Design an enzyme around this catalytic site. Structure first.
Site: not given
Ligand SMILES: NC(=O)c1[nH]c(Br)cc(=O)c1O
Ligand SMILES: [Mn+2]
Ligand SMILES: [Mn+2]
Length: 180
Positions: A116, A62, A90
């Site tokens: 998720k 991330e 992440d």
């Molecule tokens: N773009 C991402 O990687 C992402 N996006 C969101 Br909406 C929540 C997450 O936890 C996350 O890792």
């Molecule tokens: Mn995330």
């Molecule tokens: Mn992410």
């Protein structure tokens, strides 16, 4: 407004700049989507504290631009044979050898966990959900980190919540799902 001032005050400049680049990736104005702005900052900060808690145990995925994120993921997969994820995760855990998806939610942890887990649909990516109430939920109840590190993440999130509460910003933020 108040939300933008708060975000610039409780997050360090590095996180705020990454969050603004996330906002331009999405095409949205941090001056207007202020709850999403704050959620993005909070999630960045948690990912960075998580990997700092880890000899470096975690690889941060991330916060990288997408080119570098997929470069890192592919390099990990080429040197470990771990299965490639369908969505950018992440972190990677070099001790357990698995990718980690971190979730930060204003809803119940089990609701967001299900959301998720249903999205990414891979048994191999480990999911760890944190709330603003000190609650957590993780794949197979394997919380990865020791109690001290998880305590520091929980404390930081609750503090962000109370800082928004002192500014009359928490009710708006919690009733919004933007940024989750
Ligand atoms: N773009 C991402 O990687 C992402 N996006 C969101 Br909406 C929540 C997450 O936890 C996350 O890792
Ligand atoms: Mn995330
Ligand atoms: Mn992410």
């Amino acid at each position: 407004s108040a939300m933008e001032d708060f975000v610039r005050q409780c997050f360090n400049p590095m996180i705020v700049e990454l969050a603004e680049k996330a906002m331009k990736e999405y095409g949205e104005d941090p001056k207007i989507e202020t709850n999403k702005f704050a959620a993005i900052c909070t999630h960045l900060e948690v990912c960075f504290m998580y990997s700092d808690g880890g000899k470096h145990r975690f690889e941060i995925i991330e916060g990288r631009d997408r080119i570098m994120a997929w470069t890192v993921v592919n390099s990990i997969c080429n040197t470990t044979g771990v299965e490639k994820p369908k969505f950018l995760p992440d972190l990677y855990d070099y001790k357990e050898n698995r990718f980690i998806e971190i979730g930060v939610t204003r809803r119940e942890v089990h609701i967001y966990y299900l959301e998720k887990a249903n999205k990414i649909k891979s048994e191999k990516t480990h999911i760890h959900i944190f709330s603003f109430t000190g609650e957590e939920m993780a794949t197979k109840a394997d919380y990865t980190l020791d109690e001290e590190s998880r305590a520091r993440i929980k404390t930081r999130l609750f503090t962000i919540r109370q800082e928004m509460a002192s500014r009359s910003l928490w009710d708006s933020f919690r009733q919004s799902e933007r940024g989750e």
